[PDB]
Recover the amino acids of this structure.
């Protein structure tokens, strides 16, 4: 049914209850409300409708003042159909923003309040001010700078040829075409176009019409992606001149070390424990700093299984209180065991010091997380999150009590007091050897720790892992060095963000070395930096500050920061931490917050649309389902929601108008929607909304192919790759970019055959380009897939462009999940050789490409290891341990020398060429 | 003079046959666990949804409670000022309108009541899932450990990878 019985509460106490349409906007509902109110009592005392604002409880259980009344009721989605009239009162901006933030992040801000946590509250306080400060600061800045914030340049990482370009102005039918070289600076192009018949060109910027992409700054024409892209294909670029004042329009947005007592704890009780009555429950506890232990792990007695087991045991550890480091981590695991007259149930971690540097005391109820049996069946789970389980009413829990160490509370000493204690060849050969490539070796490194600082600055990580963090004297001495350690390259800092290095002083040094990062480079690692937040102990940290810093300085960064965080708000273990960051970003980015909302609603309608299509496919055939899919899209609320928004996959892309006849789905496993767009200002973009399946694995893969493409492009090797967009947006929900003019190899063969297909798409002269496009790309993807260990390759998951470019999709299995061999396909080799039996001149070039490609990836081998090492945080099944990282080590052959590497690669290559013929028969 | 008795069978085929049995049993239990773990996560997501839905019922009711408070304060003088200058109509319309508001609250309280019954019932399930997962773990871990011991035993005896694979996959 189309209508809803809505309850209306008037501010005279009077109550009305009449039906309205779900499609009706709030402004219309008010008119109808006032017409009905006439004939109800106390109407003479109301003001006009403009004096009042509707209020409702939205889907996040929060009150929302509905200030925009052009919005439809079905779009508001109140919990129950209940609207209350209230005064158009007070600071409506703050209230309106908080409501929109709650809806946007998919967590009500009140839930943060509900926790009654100082840490949460201090974070929200500090960061929201910090982000609001940046926002206000940003506003004052000029159009040039604001353009660089809003729409930062997209450049390629070199000949001097000449091809024409179309330039026009805003709100004008007439457009000018004229000649221009590849190596011109954009200022010169504007100056030329500005000669309209016979203003000044410095008060202008060139826009790529149809998309939010601008051309400006001290850079040549060909370094821009749009120009580079069009010049490769040969097409005329279509730019548009935009005035400086027109940009200002967009800009409109508004004591411990004395305590030599051994450390101990009181294990009181368990709660809501679900287990076999025959077994008996035990709790094992252990202290940790990072991965490594601080002392031996104690245990409890065998108490019999029940929901509410009681222990009341003084668990005393083999370590003093003064010995405990800053990031000391008490770690519980509850086990069900046989009496003996094992099953890990759950686990819980706990920081011994709190966020204000205070050693915790008194009762803590730790809400445990369930243990999942993995291959490495460890006693405890020290890598697991410190954050409590949010399922507090139903989840199991452990009640403990840290005893009172002293009458007055104790804090961990300040930097000044750490530096106080910190101040207090045959060795040169032995040390070098160890660091040039272990209980004996650790003590050597430790003794010579000052020589490491002076002569082996990059070996800082090693020195930290050799430090005895259980001894507090040692910890002082190591920090002393660290606070005057020389600044390391980005590559070293990336290693230092890993869970092995939990100390705040390490992380701070890590971030300090990462500030030299450019936005292009930072973006290349953004996914990894987000995952590392899951290792963080406290909410307020350097890494959050840094990510927010850069997200406010660059809108593209902000965009993908938002989506990475948003897409895991379903995950209990990060929902809180991520929720507070999303809030902070939104407060510092009120403008972009409007764009992200519009996207979220598109994604919400799509889910609902996909659910319908899933259900209909089982009932009815495809044609009727496709027809009924369009009907749902034709609806006013749907069409407007899906139309006119920046693409989540790329915010510079405009998804203007949905082509409903061109929209459909795909018979595939989770029936992904195929949505097609077009814009009359440009320019025919397509997306795939996939829901039910996880897209995180693909994104990572594509990220790494993109990085390879950059690494190769930096050596002057464009291998014509296609690192298409892929972005997880929610729980088992994402968008995939549709690459226009492309099909799978299976389909092209289903219609020898691959070669003929290229003839029809590249007649005469073009065909020579198409082969080169194929070869260059076939090389890059041959290497990429070998390195990353991407198995399961076949005709359905390899596609080819009409341009000639080959590319892979659906990277579900990777890192050999046994070694994937190197793979040359006869059908590809046949194209590479231009149809010939033997064309060794051409095949040698292709061999050269593969070698040069692979060589270059080894030169940046540690970059790949380090990044993957951080992605172990993401909890992907196929990337969860050292073995998965070892795959890359062996596939890039980093242990072997560069000469040894190439000889082995050739042997593999040759056997791939041998195997190519056998497979075909 | 070193011992560790673990493997039951003692010949390369009989052990490899047992490796095929234990691997199949491992993978089937893993599927049982993973299948329940979807139920756990889904039920956890659903239970939280029900919990915020209850907070929504609270915050709605709270709005109706505020409406009643207002109705009572606001209406006092009007009913008295219409008693004198005898408009008995306007008094009865107000009170009936108020009685209609009070009547609507009781429906929302019933609707809240039902959702609390669901969350109570689904909390019982959540625990039942978690109980079943914890009875499966020891078997699942024993099957992983056994499987690996047989693999190691056959690897020691020098059995080729080809023979190991056809027993596993
Ligand atoms: C995990 C995953 N990844 C993908 C995936 C990733 N891509 C595509 N699918 C993809 C699919 C079709 C197209 C395409 C373009 N034109 N045409 C047609 C109509 C044939 C044409 N030539 O007239 C098809 C382009 C594509 O873009 C590349 C990236 N899928 C899917 C299995 C759901 N699943």
């Amino acid at each position: 049914n189309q209508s809803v019985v809505v309850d209306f509460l008037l501010p005279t106490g009077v109550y009305l209850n009449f039906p309205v349409s779900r499609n009706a906007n709030l402004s219309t509902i008010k008119q109808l409300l006032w017409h009905r109110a006439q004939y109800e009592p106390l109407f003479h005392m109301l003001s006009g409708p403009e004096a009042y604002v509707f209020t409702c409880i939205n889907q996040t259980a929060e009150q929302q003042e509905l200030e925009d009344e052009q919005r439809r009721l079905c779009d508001v989605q109140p919990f129950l159909p209940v609207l209350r009239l209230v005064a158009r009162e007070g600071d409506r901006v703050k209230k309106l923003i908080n409501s929109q933030i709650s809806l946007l992040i998919g967590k009500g801000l009140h839930e943060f309040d509900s926790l009654c946590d100082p840490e949460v509250n201090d974070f929200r306080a500090k960061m929201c001010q910090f982000c609001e400060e940046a926002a206000a600061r940003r506003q004052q800045l000029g159009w040039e700078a604001w353009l660089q914030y809003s729409f930062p340049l997209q450049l390629e990482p070199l000949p001097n040829r000449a091809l024409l370009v179309n330039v026009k102005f805003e709100g004008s039918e007439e457009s000018f075409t004229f000649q221009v070289s590849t190596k011109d600076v954009p200022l010169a192009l504007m100056a030329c176009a500005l000669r309209k018949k016979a203003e000044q060109p410095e008060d202008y910027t060139l826009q790529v019409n149809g998309r939010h992409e601008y051309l400006y700054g001290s850079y040549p024409l060909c370094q821009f992606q749009y120009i580079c892209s069009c010049l490769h294909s040969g097409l005329t670029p279509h730019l548009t001149m935009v005035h400086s004042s027109s940009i200002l329009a967009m800009r409109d947005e508004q004591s411990l070390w004395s305590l030599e007592q051994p450390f101990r704890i009181e294990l009181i009780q368990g709660s809501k424990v679900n287990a076999d009555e025959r077994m008996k429950l035990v709790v094992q506890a252990g202290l940790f700093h990072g991965n490594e232990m601080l002392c031996k792990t104690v245990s409890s007695s065998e108490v019999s299984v029940c929901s509410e087991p009681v222990w009341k045991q003084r668990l005393e550890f083999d370590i003093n209180i003064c010995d405990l480091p800053r990031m000391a981590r008490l770690c519980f695991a509850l086990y069900a065991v046989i009496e003996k007259a094992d099953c890990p149930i759950a686990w819980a971690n706990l920081m011994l010091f709190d966020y204000k540097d205070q050693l915790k005391t008194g009762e803590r109820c730790l809400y445990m997380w369930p243990s999942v049996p993995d291959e490495k069946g460890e006693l405890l789970n020290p890598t697991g999150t410190v954050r409590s389980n949010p399922n507090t009413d139903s989840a199991a829990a452990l009640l403990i009590c840290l005893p009172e160490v002293a009458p007055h509370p104790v804090y961990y000493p300040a930097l000044e007091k750490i530096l106080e204690l910190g101040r207090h060849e045959e060795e040169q050969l032995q040390l070098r050897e160890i660091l040039e490539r272990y209980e004996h070796e650790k003590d050597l490194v430790w003794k010579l720790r000052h020589e490491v600082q002076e002569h082996f600055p990059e070996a800082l990580a090693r020195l930290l892992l050799v430090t005895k963090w259980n001894k507090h004297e040692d910890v002082a001495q190591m920090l002393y060095l660290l606070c005057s350690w020389p600044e390391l390259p980005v590559l070293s800092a990336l290693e230092l963000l890993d869970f092995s290095f939990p100390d705040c002083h390490v992380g701070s040094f890590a971030i300090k070395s990462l500030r030299k990062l450019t936005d292009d480079e930072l973006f290349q690692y953004l996914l990894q930096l987000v995952q590392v937040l899951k290792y963080e102990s406290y909410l307020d940290c350097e890494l959050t500050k840094f990510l927010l810093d850069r997200a406010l300085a660059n809108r593209k960064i902000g965009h993908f920061l938002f989506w990475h965080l948003r897409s895991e708000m379903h995950v209990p273990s990060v929902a809180l931490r991520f929720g507070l960051i999303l809030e902070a970003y939104c407060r510092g980015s009120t403008h972009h917050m409007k764009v992200l909302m519009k996207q979220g609603e598109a994604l919400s309608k799509l889910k609902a649309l996909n659910d319908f299509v899933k259900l209909s496919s089982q009932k009815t055939p495809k044609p009727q389902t496709k027809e009924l899919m369009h009907l749902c899209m034709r609806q006013e609320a749907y069409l407007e929601a899906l139309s006119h928004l920046q693409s989540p996959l790329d915010p510079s892309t405009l998804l203007a108008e949905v082509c409903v006849e061109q929209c459909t789905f795909m018979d595939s496993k989770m029936k992904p929607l195929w949505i097609m767009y077009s814009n009359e200002e440009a320019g025919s973009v397509g997306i795939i909304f996939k829901n039910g399946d996880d897209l995180r694995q693909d994104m990572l893969t594509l990220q790494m192919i993109q990085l390879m493409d950059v690494l190769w492009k930096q050596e002057g090797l464009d291998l014509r790759m296609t690192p298409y967009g892929c972005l997880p947006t929610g729980d088992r929900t994402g968008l995939i970019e549709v690459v226009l003019r492309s099909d799978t190899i299976a389909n092209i063969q289903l219609n020898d055959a691959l070669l003929n297909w290229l003839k029809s798409k590249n007649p005469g002269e073009a065909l020579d380009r198409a082969i080169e496009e194929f070869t260059l790309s076939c090389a890059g993807y041959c290497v990429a897939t070998y390195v990353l260990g991407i198995g399961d390759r076949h005709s359905d998951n390899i596609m080819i462009r009409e341009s000639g470019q080959l590319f892979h999709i659906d990277f579900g299995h990777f890192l050999g999940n046994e070694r994937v061999p190197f793979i040359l396909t006869y059908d590809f080799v046949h194209v590479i050789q231009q149809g010939k039996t033997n064309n060794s001149e051409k095949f040698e070039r292709f061999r050269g490409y593969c070698e040069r490609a692979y060589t270059i990836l080894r030169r940046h081998g540690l970059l790949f290891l380090h990044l993957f090492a951080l992605m172990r945080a993401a909890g992907l099944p196929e990337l969860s341990c050292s073995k998965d990282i070892q795959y890359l080590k062996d596939s890039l052959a980093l242990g072997k020398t560069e000469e040894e590497a190439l000889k082995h690669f050739r042997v593999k290559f040759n056997e791939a060429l041998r195997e190519s013929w056998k497979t075909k028969v | 003079y070193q011992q560790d008795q673990v493997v039951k069978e003692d010949n390369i085929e009989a052990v490899g046959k047992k490796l095929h049995e234990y691997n199949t049993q491992f993978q089937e239990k893993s599927r049982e666990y993973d299948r329940l773990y979807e139920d756990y996560t889904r039920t956890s997501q659903e239970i939280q949804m029900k919990r915020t839905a209850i907070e929504a019922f609270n915050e709605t009711i709270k709005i109706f409670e505020e409406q009643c408070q207002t109705q009572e304060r606001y209406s006092k003088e009007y009913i008295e000022k219409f008693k004198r200058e005898g408009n008995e109509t306007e008094i009865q319309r107000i009170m009936h309108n108020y009685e209609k508001l009070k009547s609507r609250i009781s429906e929302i309280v019933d609707s809240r009541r039902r959702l609390e019954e669901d969350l109570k019932k689904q909390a019982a399930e959540y625990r039942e899932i978690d109980k079943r997962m914890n009875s499966i773990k020891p078997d699942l871990i024993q099957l992983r450990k056994t499987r690996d011991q047989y693999l190691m035993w056959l690897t020691q005896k020098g059995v080729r990878q080809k023979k190991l694979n056809e027993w596993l996959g």
